[PDB]
């Protein structure tokens, strides 16, 4: 089920930029003299390639946020410069250019009968110069300065890194190479020019191990499923029927239910997986099954207390103590109330007198994990007395004492049955020692292959595990060792690192988007959509379950983390030049100025006679955004009624009128009555005056040579002039480099001889010869 | 450049690889194969027999594991053999203005096989402590099997040397020595077959 | 005269290669290696004539 969902994760795709991200493109426009006639020679200026910006300053900021999101989603990881190259037909040195549209622009400029020859010769002089000895090439490009800055920033922060065989040799986690039982081998070389991508290896910053138990439990369940998939199976189990009949002979009957190989395999896999992923487990057993109790006692001897729910631990301890321990020495049986902070084993330690049993109980009481930081990854390691398996002897001696006391206040048959059980468990001491050492080594080796922080916090969903399987495992283990297969281990490691990298990448994307949204003074956006996108893109949840409240709490938690450097600088660049991008649009204006005083108009070499106010000084500034937001109209109405100067700043669509009849007959101020009458400024449409020779009405301004005078001006800035000698640039890049992904497929490992396996202390793992 | 392919469960493969490493200079392979083979051989035969801890090692050290083996074992025969393999490299000579890489004289006449046989026979009667019964018996009997072919191994190795000399004589273009991208798969089982 | 075409013909006329797979940066390195070698006297004298 979920195994496919958590195993079908591929590394995040590195986009290959097919063309430079363009916002500005050249456009050829006519011009007029200061008098207002055509010049019969056109000039090329800058215009936005896209003109989908809607009116309203809030919608402007929304469009800016969408633009930032598009730029960050289309980020180039490795930027090739040989692929994007079309040969220029006009370069008399047979050069090559960066983009097909650049070639079209070069052809247009090279062939225009109204253009001079210096620019044409500069066009023809373009040629790429390649210096392969230092792995650097130069290309020509024509862009608006914003686009050139963005392209340079993309170029100079690529994620590639030189690759060598020893680098991959060091890419494996250290606690695998350092051990002897695993050996690595290669079969191919690597060139000095190849490059690869490093994943992200930063720890948790959402604190999902605290106060977010739902998603944490979901992730733990997924990782537990994966671990169950990866942990190796058992080989060479003793025949079930022979073991059953041998135990039956040993017990002298005239119990054994639940002893099958599948049970042992499931118990082994479940125990290892739960230990690995910190998924707590709950037990269940019939209180009148002594052998189950002893097997559970062994299980508690090996595995520490912290990985068990208080209910199961309390029940197991109560059963063990009041069925064996106080029964031995004939002391009054304890009544451990369900809910005291003390544990039954602690009270037993404080009560009994004999040495070995008390020592063993004391060991099982306070045996906690140790937090150890290795190679930047936090891990949980058992006490060193458990890996070499000596503590089992400290168990058995105590059990041996249990066979010496007379068991007073009990019938003979009960003592006989308990002695039979303890003897059956005792005769298999070597099997238990080998199993415990194998478990320790397998846990250490496997757990050394995870790269995310782990915490010991009980979660909501609890694993079910019956003790009969544990009894079967303890009675059925044999001689053949089991070592995890290198192929499975590498597959598990690849999946884990892929998951971690995906998580970190999505975190950074969400943080960048939220930071930009909150710094652009956006406050009318339901922010649950971004969190929903993040959760969906993590590719393990369904947004149909987690409600909105946790999304908002996660957003508040996420705001604190400082954003990554590249995205922060991208946002800084896109915000520092916001005004130039916004004003240069030819679909919206920046406000309307009203003065009710005779003022002259401006003369520009792109609009002819246009009504434009470059600055807004000397007037009262009123925000249209606030005007729509609060719904008030008090100050503006009183200012306009008494015919006093006013200034409005905000986004407004414009209507172009090019009739001198409209100029003489004042109609540029009659679009303010609806503000009072309709009391809504959503569709305010100021009229843009424009006089030139194209309109066939310019003879009025020529015959009588009068200076046009109006009463309104529009807050619009004339677009900046275009010069070819300035947009030219020599982009820097790398000649050629093969990007490598899925790197670990180039290393193969061979299992050591299973007999000669060495775990941690220069000794063989299993020894039952 | 030759890559080494093996299945570590076949100890006879590593036993034959001992001869392979003795005959062919170690600079003809890629570093991955050399370090893998050295680590396996050292941690499956010799250090197992000499009661020493398994060689903790880190990939990428400037010194090969065989050097560490040379400066950690004081058994004269195997130590001398390990040193000889350690400093066995292609010899740079120029003949008639033509650059060539040729083997050392000692291996050319077929003499190192006697040293290998003596070292193997020394390992044969060794105590081999802290190892199970059947595994140790099989290991030492395979070692005896490879030792029991002394004359044939000498003839084979010196025939290889003579064939190499004769073929290399007519090479016109010089040959440099540098690692390359691709390699050729050498079958360890085939090496064992040729040896036996 | 695009030197890449000449290097392509030279590589293809070695009968042991395949031009359609070669990388461009290595081609440029090979070209720069070729630029600095002195030509044999016969061809230089033919060019002089």
């Amino acid at each position: 089920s979920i195994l496919k969902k958590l195993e079908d994760i591929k590394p995040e795709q590195a986009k290959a930029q097919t063309k430079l991200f363009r916002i500005f493109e050249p456009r050829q426009k006519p011009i007029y003299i200061a008098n207002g006639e055509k010049e019969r020679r056109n000039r090329i200026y800058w215009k936005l390639k896209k003109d989908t910006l809607p009116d309203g300053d809030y919608d402007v900021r929304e469009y800016f946020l969408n633009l930032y999101d598009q730029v960050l989603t289309e980020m180039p990881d490795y930027l090739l410069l040989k692929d994007m190259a079309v040969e220029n037909k006009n370069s008399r040195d047979a050069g090559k250019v960066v983009d097909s549209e650049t070639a079209s622009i070069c052809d247009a400029i090279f062939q225009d009968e109204e253009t001079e020859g210096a620019v044409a010769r500069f066009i023809a002089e373009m040629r790429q110069r390649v210096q392969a000895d230092r792995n650097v090439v130069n290309y020509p490009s024509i862009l608006h300065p914003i686009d050139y800055a963005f392209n340079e920033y993309f170029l100079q922060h690529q994620l590639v890194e030189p690759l060598n065989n020893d680098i991959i040799f060091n890419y494996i986690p250290e606690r695998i190479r350092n051990d002897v039982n695993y050996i690595l081998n290669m079969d191919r070389n690597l060139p000095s020019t190849a490059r690869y991508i490093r994943p992200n290896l930063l720890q948790d910053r959402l604190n999902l191990h605290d106060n977010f138990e739902s998603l944490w439990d979901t992730i733990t369940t997924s990782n537990y499923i994966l671990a169950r998939s990866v942990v190796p199976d058992l080989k060479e189990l003793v025949s079930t029927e022979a073991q059953i009949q041998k135990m039956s002979q040993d017990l002298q009957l005239e119990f054994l239910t639940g002893i099958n190989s599948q049970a042992a395999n499931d118990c082994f896999k479940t125990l290892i997986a739960a230990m690995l992923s910190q998924r707590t487990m709950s037990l269940d057993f019939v209180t009148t099954n002594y052998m189950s109790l002893i097997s559970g006692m062994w299980l508690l001897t090996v595995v520490p207390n912290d990985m068990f729910i208080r209910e199961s631990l309390v029940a197991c301890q109560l059963a063990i103590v009041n069925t064996i321990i106080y029964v031995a020495f004939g002391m009054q049986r304890m009544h451990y109330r369900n809910g005291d902070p003390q544990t039954p084993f602690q009270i037993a330690e404080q009560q009994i007198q004999n040495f070995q049993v008390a020592n063993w109980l004391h060991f099982v009481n306070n045996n906690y994990f140790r937090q150890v930081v290795i190679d930047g990854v936090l891990n949980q390691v058992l006490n060193d007395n458990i890996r070499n398996g000596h503590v089992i002897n400290q168990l058995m001696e105590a059990l041996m004492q249990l066979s010496r006391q007379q068991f007073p206040t009990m019938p003979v048959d009960y003592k006989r049955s308990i002695q039979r059980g303890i003897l059956l468990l005792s005769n298999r001491l070597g099997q238990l020692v080998d199993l415990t050492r194998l478990l320790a080594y397998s846990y250490e080796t496997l757990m050394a292959c995870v790269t995310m922080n782990m915490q010991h916090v009980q979660t909501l969903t609890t694993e079910k595990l019956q003790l009969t399987s544990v009894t079967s495992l303890c009675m059925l283990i044999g001689n053949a060792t089991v070592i995890p297969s290198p192929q499975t281990l590498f597959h598990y490691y690849n999946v884990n690192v892929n998951f971690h990298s995906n998580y970190n990448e999505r975190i950074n994307d969400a943080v960048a988007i939220i930071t930009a949204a909150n710094r652009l003074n956006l406050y009318q956006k339901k922010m649950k959509a971004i969190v929903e996108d993040f959760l969906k893109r993590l590719h393990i949840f369904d947004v149909a379950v987690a409600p909105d409240d946790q999304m908002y709490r996660l957003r508040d938690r996420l705001r604190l983390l400082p954003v990554e450097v590249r995205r922060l600088d991208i946002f800084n660049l896109i915000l520092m030049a916001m005004d130039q991008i916004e004003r240069a649009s030819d679909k919206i204006a920046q406000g309307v100025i009203i003065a009710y005083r005779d003022m002259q108009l401006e003369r520009d070499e792109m609009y002819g006679y246009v009504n434009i106010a470059r600055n807004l000084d000397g007037f009262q500034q009123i925000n249209l955004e606030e005007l729509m937001r609060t719904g008030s109209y008090a100050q503006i109405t009183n200012m306009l009624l008494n015919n006093q100067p006013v200034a409005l700043v905000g986004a407004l669509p414009f209507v172009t009128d090019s009739s001198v009849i409209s100029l003489i007959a004042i109609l540029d101020a009659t679009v303010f009555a609806q503000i009072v009458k309709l009391r809504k400024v959503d569709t305010l449409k100021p009229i843009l005056y424009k006089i030139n020779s194209d309109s066939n009405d310019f003879y009025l301004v020529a015959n009588y040579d009068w200076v046009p005078i109006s009463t309104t001006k529009v807050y619009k800035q004339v677009p900046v002039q275009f010069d070819f000698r300035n947009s030219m640039h020599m982009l820097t890049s790398n000649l050629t480099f093969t990007v490598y992904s899925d790197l670990l497929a180039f290393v193969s490992a061979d299992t050591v001889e299973p007999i000669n396996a060495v775990a941690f202390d220069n000794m063989r793992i299993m020894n039952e010869l | 450049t030759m890559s080494l392919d093996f299945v570590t469960t076949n100890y006879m493969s590593l036993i034959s690889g001992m001869w392979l490493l003795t005959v062919v200079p170690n600079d003809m392979f890629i570093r991955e194969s050399l370090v893998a083979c050295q680590l396996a051989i050292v941690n499956t035969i010799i250090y197992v027999a000499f009661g020493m801890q398994r060689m903790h090692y880190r990939n990428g050290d400037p010194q090969t594991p065989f050097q560490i083996a040379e400066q950690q074992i004081q058994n004269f025969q195997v130590a001398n053999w390990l040193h000889f393999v350690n400093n066995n490299y292609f010899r740079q000579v120029v003949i008639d203005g033509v650059l060539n890489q040729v083997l050392n004289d000692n291996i050319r006449n077929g003499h190192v096989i006697n040293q290998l046989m003596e070292a193997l026979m020394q390992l044969s009667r060794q105590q081999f402590p802290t190892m199970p019964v059947d595994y140790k018996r099989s290991i030492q009997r395979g070692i005896l099997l490879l030792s029991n072919r002394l004359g044939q191994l000498v003839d084979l190795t010196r025939l290889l040397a003579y064939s190499y000399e004769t073929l290399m004589a007519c090479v016109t273009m010089n040959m440099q020595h540098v690692q390359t991208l691709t390699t050729e798969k050498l079958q360890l089982t085939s090496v064992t077959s040729l040896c036996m | 005269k695009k030197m890449k075409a000449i290097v392509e013909d030279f590589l293809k006329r070695l009968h042991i290669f395949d031009v359609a797979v070669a990388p461009d940066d290595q081609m440029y390195r090979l070209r720069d290696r070729l630029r600095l070698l002195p030509v044999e006297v016969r061809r230089l004298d033919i060019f002089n004539l």
């Binding site: 191919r188 060139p191 192929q487 597959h491 093969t738 490598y740 992904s741 899925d742 790197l743 497929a745 180039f746 | 991208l181 691709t182 | 590589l11 290669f17 395949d18 031009v19 797979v21 070669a22 990388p23």
Partner: peptide, 20 residues
């Protein structure tokens, strides 16, 4: 293992597409 072999073939083919 078959998927692993397919992935390794893909990687080695990417490497081989730089050898004439």
């Amino acid at each position: 293992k078959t998927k692993e072999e397919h992935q390794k073939e893909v990687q080695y083919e990417i490497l081989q597409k730089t050898i004439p």
